[PDB]
Design an enzyme around this catalytic site. Structure first.
Site, PDB file in Angstrom:
ATOM      1  CG  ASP A  57      -1.872   1.077   1.291  1.00 35.58           C
ATOM      2  OD1 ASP A  57      -2.982   0.889   0.716  1.00 35.58           O
ATOM      3  OD2 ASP A  57      -1.495   2.092   1.853  1.00 35.58           O
ATOM      4  CG  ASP A  59      -2.537   6.000   1.375  1.00 38.11           C
ATOM      5  OD1 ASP A  59      -2.695   4.813   1.575  1.00 38.11           O
ATOM      6  OD2 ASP A  59      -3.445   6.729   0.997  1.00 38.11           O
ATOM      7  CD  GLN A  61      -4.474   7.603   5.771  1.00 31.85           C
ATOM      8  OE1 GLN A  61      -5.340   7.730   6.702  1.00 31.85           O
ATOM      9  NE2 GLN A  61      -4.048   8.593   4.962  1.00 31.85           N
ATOM     10  CG  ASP A 138     -16.325 -17.027  15.395  1.00 32.35           C
ATOM     11  OD1 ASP A 138     -17.404 -17.263  15.904  1.00 32.35           O
ATOM     12  OD2 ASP A 138     -16.196 -16.592  14.261  1.00 32.35           O
ATOM     13  CG  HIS A 142     -12.138 -22.959  13.338  1.00 27.00           C
ATOM     14  ND1 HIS A 142     -13.215 -23.670  13.894  1.00 27.00           N
ATOM     15  CD2 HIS A 142     -11.618 -23.682  12.320  1.00 27.00           C
ATOM     16  CE1 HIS A 142     -13.256 -24.843  13.231  1.00 27.00           C
ATOM     17  NE2 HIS A 142     -12.315 -24.874  12.274  1.00 27.00           N
ATOM     18  CD  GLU A 143      -9.880 -22.086   9.080  1.00 28.53           C
ATOM     19  OE1 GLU A 143      -9.197 -23.146   9.091  1.00 28.53           O
ATOM     20  OE2 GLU A 143     -11.142 -22.031   9.054  1.00 28.53           O
ATOM     21  CG  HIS A 146      -7.432 -26.306  11.749  1.00 27.94           C
ATOM     22  ND1 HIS A 146      -7.853 -27.528  12.315  1.00 27.94           N
ATOM     23  CD2 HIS A 146      -8.468 -25.758  11.100  1.00 27.94           C
ATOM     24  CE1 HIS A 146      -9.138 -27.643  12.009  1.00 27.94           C
ATOM     25  NE2 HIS A 146      -9.550 -26.587  11.287  1.00 27.94           N
ATOM     26  CE1 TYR A 157     -10.757 -31.433   7.897  1.00 27.59           C
ATOM     27  CE2 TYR A 157     -10.210 -30.989  10.206  1.00 27.59           C
ATOM     28  CZ  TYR A 157     -10.968 -30.680   9.079  1.00 27.59           C
ATOM     29  OH  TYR A 157     -11.859 -29.664   9.024  1.00 27.59           O
ATOM     30  CD  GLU A 166     -13.065 -28.634  11.880  1.00 28.02           C
ATOM     31  OE1 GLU A 166     -12.042 -28.464  11.234  1.00 28.02           O
ATOM     32  OE2 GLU A 166     -13.806 -27.715  12.188  1.00 28.02           O
ATOM     33  CG  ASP A 185     -21.456 -15.472  19.676  1.00 30.10           C
ATOM     34  OD1 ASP A 185     -21.495 -14.380  19.102  1.00 30.10           O
ATOM     35  OD2 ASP A 185     -20.738 -16.397  19.294  1.00 30.10           O
ATOM     36  CD  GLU A 187     -24.959 -19.749  18.537  1.00 33.36           C
ATOM     37  OE1 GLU A 187     -25.181 -20.243  19.704  1.00 33.36           O
ATOM     38  OE2 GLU A 187     -25.395 -20.188  17.464  1.00 33.36           O
ATOM     39  CB  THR A 194     -26.750 -15.972   6.038  1.00 37.67           C
ATOM     40  OG1 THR A 194     -26.920 -15.901   7.470  1.00 37.67           O
ATOM     41  CG2 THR A 194     -26.462 -17.399   5.482  1.00 37.67           C
ATOM     42  CB  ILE A 197     -30.421 -14.982   7.842  1.00 39.72           C
ATOM     43  CG1 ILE A 197     -30.579 -15.721   6.479  1.00 39.72           C
ATOM     44  CG2 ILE A 197     -31.451 -15.492   8.821  1.00 39.72           C
ATOM     45  CD1 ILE A 197     -31.065 -14.962   5.238  1.00 39.72           C
ATOM     46  CG  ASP A 226     -17.684 -32.848   7.412  1.00 37.12           C
ATOM     47  OD1 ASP A 226     -16.830 -32.042   7.003  1.00 37.12           O
ATOM     48  OD2 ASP A 226     -18.260 -32.777   8.502  1.00 37.12           O
ATOM     49  CG  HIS A 231     -16.531 -29.374   9.500  1.00 33.05           C
ATOM     50  ND1 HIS A 231     -15.955 -30.015   8.411  1.00 33.05           N
ATOM     51  CD2 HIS A 231     -15.733 -28.351   9.907  1.00 33.05           C
ATOM     52  CE1 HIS A 231     -14.843 -29.354   8.172  1.00 33.05           C
ATOM     53  NE2 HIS A 231     -14.675 -28.342   9.033  1.00 33.05           N
TER      54      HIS A 231
HETATM   55  C1  LIG Z   1     -14.970 -22.176  10.244  1.00 27.59           C
HETATM   56  C2  LIG Z   1     -15.194 -22.343   8.723  1.00 27.59           C
HETATM   57  C3  LIG Z   1     -15.516 -20.931   8.215  1.00 27.59           C
HETATM   58  C4  LIG Z   1     -14.072 -23.059   7.872  1.00 27.59           C
HETATM   59  C5  LIG Z   1     -13.865 -24.520   8.239  1.00 27.59           C
HETATM   60  N1  LIG Z   1     -12.828 -25.162   7.444  1.00 27.59           N
HETATM   61  P1  LIG Z   1     -11.713 -25.911   7.916  1.00 27.59           P
HETATM   62  O1  LIG Z   1     -12.184 -26.436   9.294  1.00 27.59           O
HETATM   63  O2  LIG Z   1     -10.579 -25.030   8.158  1.00 27.59           O
HETATM   64  O3  LIG Z   1     -11.449 -26.967   6.853  1.00 27.59           O
HETATM   65  C6  LIG Z   1     -12.225 -28.050   6.451  1.00 27.59           C
HETATM   66  O4  LIG Z   1     -11.418 -29.240   6.270  1.00 27.59           O
HETATM   67  C7  LIG Z   1     -10.294 -29.141   5.339  1.00 27.59           C
HETATM   68  C8  LIG Z   1      -9.493 -30.442   5.188  1.00 27.59           C
HETATM   69  C9  LIG Z   1     -10.877 -28.535   4.051  1.00 27.59           C
HETATM   70  O5  LIG Z   1      -9.937 -28.444   3.021  1.00 27.59           O
HETATM   71  C10 LIG Z   1     -11.474 -27.178   4.378  1.00 27.59           C
HETATM   72  O6  LIG Z   1     -12.032 -26.509   3.262  1.00 27.59           O
HETATM   73  C11 LIG Z   1     -12.699 -27.466   5.161  1.00 27.59           C
HETATM   74  O7  LIG Z   1     -13.408 -28.434   4.289  1.00 27.59           O
HETATM   75  C12 LIG Z   1     -15.211 -25.184   8.282  1.00 27.59           C
HETATM   76  O8  LIG Z   1     -15.841 -24.993   9.313  1.00 27.59           O
HETATM   77  N2  LIG Z   1     -15.608 -25.914   7.177  1.00 27.59           N
HETATM   78  C13 LIG Z   1     -16.847 -26.699   7.025  1.00 27.59           C
HETATM   79  C14 LIG Z   1     -18.051 -25.744   7.196  1.00 27.59           C
HETATM   80  C15 LIG Z   1     -18.256 -24.863   6.034  1.00 27.59           C
HETATM   81  C16 LIG Z   1     -17.590 -23.704   5.788  1.00 27.59           C
HETATM   82  N3  LIG Z   1     -18.001 -23.152   4.613  1.00 27.59           N
HETATM   83  C17 LIG Z   1     -18.968 -23.949   4.077  1.00 27.59           C
HETATM   84  C18 LIG Z   1     -19.667 -23.794   2.894  1.00 27.59           C
HETATM   85  C19 LIG Z   1     -20.584 -24.786   2.609  1.00 27.59           C
HETATM   86  C20 LIG Z   1     -20.781 -25.909   3.447  1.00 27.59           C
HETATM   87  C21 LIG Z   1     -20.095 -26.062   4.635  1.00 27.59           C
HETATM   88  C22 LIG Z   1     -19.157 -25.063   4.948  1.00 27.59           C
HETATM   89  C23 LIG Z   1     -16.853 -27.611   5.772  1.00 27.59           C
HETATM   90  O9  LIG Z   1     -15.903 -27.329   4.983  1.00 27.59           O
HETATM   91  O10 LIG Z   1     -17.772 -28.524   5.627  1.00 27.59           O
HETATM   92 CA   LIG Z   2     -26.475 -14.344   9.248  1.00 26.68          CA
HETATM   93 CA   LIG Z   3     -18.894 -16.521  17.691  1.00 29.03          CA
HETATM   94 CA   LIG Z   4      -3.972   2.997   0.903  1.00 28.87          CA
HETATM   95 CA   LIG Z   5     -19.728 -12.903  18.263  1.00 31.41          CA
HETATM   96 ZN   LIG Z   6     -11.712 -26.563  10.971  1.00 31.08          ZN
END
Ligand SMILES: CC(C)C[C@H](NP(=O)(O)O[C@@H]1O[C@@H](C)[C@H](O)[C@@H](O)[C@H]1O)C(=O)N[C@@H](Cc1c[nH]c2ccccc12)C(=O)O
Ligand SMILES: [Ca+2]
Ligand SMILES: [Ca+2]
Ligand SMILES: [Ca+2]
Ligand SMILES: [Ca+2]
Ligand SMILES: [Zn+2]
Length: 316
Positions: A57, A59, A61, A138, A142-143, A146, A157, A166, A185, A187, A194, A197, A226, A231
């Site tokens: 970047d 500047d 900003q 979160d 979460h990532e 991992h 996995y 997970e 929270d 969640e 979404t 929603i 899965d 998950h």
């Molecule tokens: C916290 C979340 C934003 C990302 C998270 N992925 P992650 O736990 O890092 O990784 C999971 O396993 C790996 C081996 C895959 O390559 C990743 O894509 C993912 O499938 C997950 O909850 N993945 C689920 C839930 C999910 C996220 N995006 C989605 C879109 C559609 C359906 C389900 C999902 C899944 O992949 O099933």
């Molecule tokens: Ca939402």
């Molecule tokens: Ca949360």
């Molecule tokens: Ca800039």
């Molecule tokens: Ca929150």
């Molecule tokens: Zn994950």
């Protein structure tokens, strides 16, 4: 990059303003020198080729809409590091201050984020199911968690050990969200999921069933999708984790809550000292009880609450 540490300002995905740590060398880069061996944020430019370009970047900003996901990935990765260092005495994901790398604007309308073994990757969402994924703290924790799991227990996995994998990510990403006091929270992904929603989330820890996830071992998914429900089945563990911390009566079994701090301590100890790549739910129970015993004594309320919790969810 070699340069001068400075501090920039930008706006996140949610429109919030924040200061970020940058590096100056002709351009201003998204490279934080203040944390371990550094935090580096890259532009994947809507491609799948990683890591992409170190973010530059002109500047210092970051207010453009294209800048949003970068700001957040960069900032939240900082917070996560801080949580690990401050709360558990751990330096980066490897315990050795390894550099943290993240790439944003991955692919086109990519509705996910992941740890690929060496760095974090964040899609922008398709704008309806998700908005850019790094806008959720979160999600970011979460990532990175991992990465932690990979260097410690190394949980495989798939199947039960993958569900554990997970759940730990969900547990620590929630703890990080509370740590930052960023509208906390129980969640998962509420802030980026979404955009049309309200009041929904990707998964619930307090009541996994809300979205169709099992909240009891008897309701566990035995199939093939899965990675054998990594998950899906995580909900059994998330529910257990929720009950130890907060307390409650689930399926007739009463658990006295011991709070979040202690939950994070027992779980971190189980992760780093007792869990192996092939651990199953029943071994996580043993691992948790044992950590609680080490920390609080066999006759503690803590140990008592971890047992109830697992009993509440049908784990042993
Ligand atoms: C916290 C979340 C934003 C990302 C998270 N992925 P992650 O736990 O890092 O990784 C999971 O396993 C790996 C081996 C895959 O390559 C990743 O894509 C993912 O499938 C997950 O909850 N993945 C689920 C839930 C999910 C996220 N995006 C989605 C879109 C559609 C359906 C389900 C999902 C899944 O992949 O099933
Ligand atoms: Ca939402
Ligand atoms: Ca949360
Ligand atoms: Ca800039
Ligand atoms: Ca929150
Ligand atoms: Zn994950």
């Amino acid at each position: 990059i070699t340069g001068t540490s400075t501090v920039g300002v930008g706006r996140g995905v949610l429109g919030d303003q924040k200061n970020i740590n940058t590096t100056y060398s002709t351009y201003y880069y998204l490279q934080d020198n203040t944390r371990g061996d550094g935090i580096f944020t890259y532009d994947a430019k809507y491609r799948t080729t990683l890591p992409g370009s170190l973010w530059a970047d002109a500047d210092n900003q970051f207010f453009a809409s294209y800048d949003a996901p970068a700001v957040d990935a960069h900032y939240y990765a900082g917070v996560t590091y801080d949580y690990y260092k401050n709360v558990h005495n751990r330096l980066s994901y490897d315990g050795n201050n390894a550099a943290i790398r993240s790439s944003v604007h991955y692919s086109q309308g990519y509705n996910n984020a992941f740890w690929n073994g060496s760095e974090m990757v964040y899609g922008d969402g398709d704008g309806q199911t998700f908005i850019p994924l790094s806008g959720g703290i979160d999600v970011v924790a979460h990532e990175l968690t991992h990465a932690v799991t990979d260097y410690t227990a190394g949980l495989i996995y798939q199947n039960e050990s993958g569900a554990i994998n997970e759940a730990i990510s969900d547990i620590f990403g929630t703890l990080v969200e509370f740590y930052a006091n960023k509208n906390p929270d129980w969640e998962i992904g509420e802030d980026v999921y979404t955009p049309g929603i309200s009041g929904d989330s990707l998964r619930s820890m307090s009541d996994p069933a809300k979205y169709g996830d099992p909240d009891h071992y008897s309701k566990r998914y035995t199939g093939t999708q899965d990675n054998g429900g990594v998950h899906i089945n995580s909900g059994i563990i998330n529910k257990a984790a929720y009950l130890i911390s907060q307390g409650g009566t689930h399926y007739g079994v009463s658990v006295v809550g011991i709070g979040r701090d202690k939950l994070g301590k027992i779980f971190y100890r189980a992760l780093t000292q007792y869990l192996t790549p092939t651990s199953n739910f029943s071994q996580l129970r043993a691992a948790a009880v044992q950590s609680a015993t080490d920390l609080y004594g066999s006759t503690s309320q803590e140990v008592a609450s971890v047992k109830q919790a697992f009993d509440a969810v049908g784990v042993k």
